[PDB]
Design an enzyme around this catalytic site. Sequence first.
Site, PDB file in Angstrom:
ATOM      1  N   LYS A  60     -14.112  36.117  47.530  1.00 61.14           N
ATOM      2  CA  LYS A  60     -14.250  36.604  48.929  1.00 61.14           C
ATOM      3  C   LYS A  60     -15.687  36.933  49.450  1.00 61.14           C
ATOM      4  O   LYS A  60     -16.044  38.118  49.661  1.00 61.14           O
ATOM      5  CB  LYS A  60     -13.155  37.568  49.413  1.00 61.14           C
ATOM      6  CG  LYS A  60     -12.810  38.720  48.475  1.00 61.14           C
ATOM      7  CD  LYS A  60     -11.820  39.700  49.107  1.00 61.14           C
ATOM      8  CE  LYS A  60     -11.102  40.579  48.097  1.00 61.14           C
ATOM      9  NZ  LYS A  60     -12.030  41.380  47.277  1.00 61.14           N
ATOM     10  N   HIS A 108     -18.964  33.433  50.636  1.00 63.05           N
ATOM     11  CA  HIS A 108     -19.539  32.080  50.375  1.00 63.05           C
ATOM     12  C   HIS A 108     -20.272  31.853  49.012  1.00 63.05           C
ATOM     13  O   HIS A 108     -21.520  32.032  48.878  1.00 63.05           O
ATOM     14  CB  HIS A 108     -20.360  31.564  51.560  1.00 63.05           C
TER      15      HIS A 108
END
Lengths: 213, 213
Positions: free
Chosen positions: A103, A105
């Site tokens: 959770k 990039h």
Amino acid sequence: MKPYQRQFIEFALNKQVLKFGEFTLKSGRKSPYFFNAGLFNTGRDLALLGRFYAEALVDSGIEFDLLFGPAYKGIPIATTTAVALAEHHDKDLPYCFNRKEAKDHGEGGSLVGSALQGRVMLVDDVITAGTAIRESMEIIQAHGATLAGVLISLDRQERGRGEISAIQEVERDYGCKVISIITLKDLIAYLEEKPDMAEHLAAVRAYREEFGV
Amino acid sequence: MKPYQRQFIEFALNKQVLKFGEFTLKSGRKSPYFFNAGLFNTGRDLALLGRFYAEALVDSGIEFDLLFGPAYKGIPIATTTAVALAEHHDKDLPYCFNRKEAKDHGEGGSLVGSALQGRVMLVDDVITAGTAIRESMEIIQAHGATLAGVLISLDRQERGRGEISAIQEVERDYGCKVISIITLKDLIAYLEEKPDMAEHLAAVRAYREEFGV
Ligand SMILES: O=P(O)(O)OC[C@H]1O[C@H](OP(=O)(O)OP(=O)(O)O)[C@H](O)[C@@H]1O
Ligand SMILES: O=P(O)(O)OC[C@H]1O[C@H](OP(=O)(O)OP(=O)(O)O)[C@H](O)[C@@H]1O
Ligand SMILES: O=C(O)c1cc(=O)[nH]c(=O)[nH]1
Ligand SMILES: O=C(O)c1cc(=O)[nH]c(=O)[nH]1
Ligand SMILES: [Mg+2]
Ligand SMILES: [Mg+2]
């Protein structure tokens, strides 16, 4: 073939985890049997599975310092195997699993349980492509732990896209060993004993012909 | 206080899951003891925990159709409790857990194991805020299953932001029952027996005074 092997097949069958029919594999092959561990979903299944996993580990004689259950499907597995080892084999080992969680990039990392430390025995149900552990060896390899082996339930022993099985590739790209409770080979051996299963026997025999490794 | 209770505390202590010192809670309270189940991370711990969980369930006499282990911390829990129930209590039940997974703008849903069907017994380690199950009752409530209860290890029995404990709120907003292996009350009772633990006794006694429910 070993005793705990035979009982394995029997349980698999019984819980209909093993099925004879006509199934389309992920690879796109039409296969005469299938194995869906997804169907071991009960207290006692779980109890029974861990006991079979421990046997197999134990009968391997490989040395390892910890159990590691991956993604999602490997946790109850690792968890059950770990209780099995300590209640019946008197082996008390550390466990550990990862949070698939990523959770933000990038990827994940995040672990639950003991420390990714030492010779790690990987634990899963089945390996079809051998890609999911490639994710899971990276974590091990990050933390600087080492891979002892992988233990699954079934080695289908059929070629991949090349001439070796997905398992041989993993063993081959990872320089580890993959242990299993049962192989195709035992399947057959088993079907050989059951006179009124000759129709399945035949078909599994033929498949091993066209695709077996 | 029950026999499996006493052994529980003893094991908790032993594995240092229970600690006496000075710890800052999530709430911001300074507390004289702490309980970190995170530290039950071994095969045998796992074996031992499931056996304690099953006892407690069993000693409750509540009726339920399935075990449900949440998020991440509840899986080995549910898994171990489920094997414990079937190997020793001869109860064979279905299990199930969710994938925290929500990979696309929304929430999750996704489950592993048996079907969210029937009276569900929730299973976790501890409830500090009582918010994590509120997520997990929504899933149950979506699938149209019903809540039997929640079972945790420890009921700290201290007020929340209001005058009741987080547990009473959950029981109160959810119309269910929360079962536990041990409470503060048993803690004390225990510390009472151990003459050279009077310093911890005193402090836990005082805390229960300022904050106990
Ligand atoms: O060898 P492969 O082709 O890579 O796949 C093998 C995996 O397939 C499933 O993974 P999945 O990611 O779906 O399981 P999960 O429910 O734990 O997420 C299953 O749990 C096996 O671990
Ligand atoms: O009652 P609460 O304040 O809501 O918290 C209680 C929860 O705290 C941790 O959840 P977490 O989400 O961190 O555990 P996980 O590792 O399974 O994700 C732990 O697993 C408990 O389930
Ligand atoms: O190769 C497959 O896709 C496959 C075969 C099998 O027996 N089980 C499974 O889960 N997948
Ligand atoms: O309230 C806390 O934050 C708390 C207390 C406790 O004993 N254990 C825990 O995990 N959290
Ligand atoms: Mg998986
Ligand atoms: Mg949790």
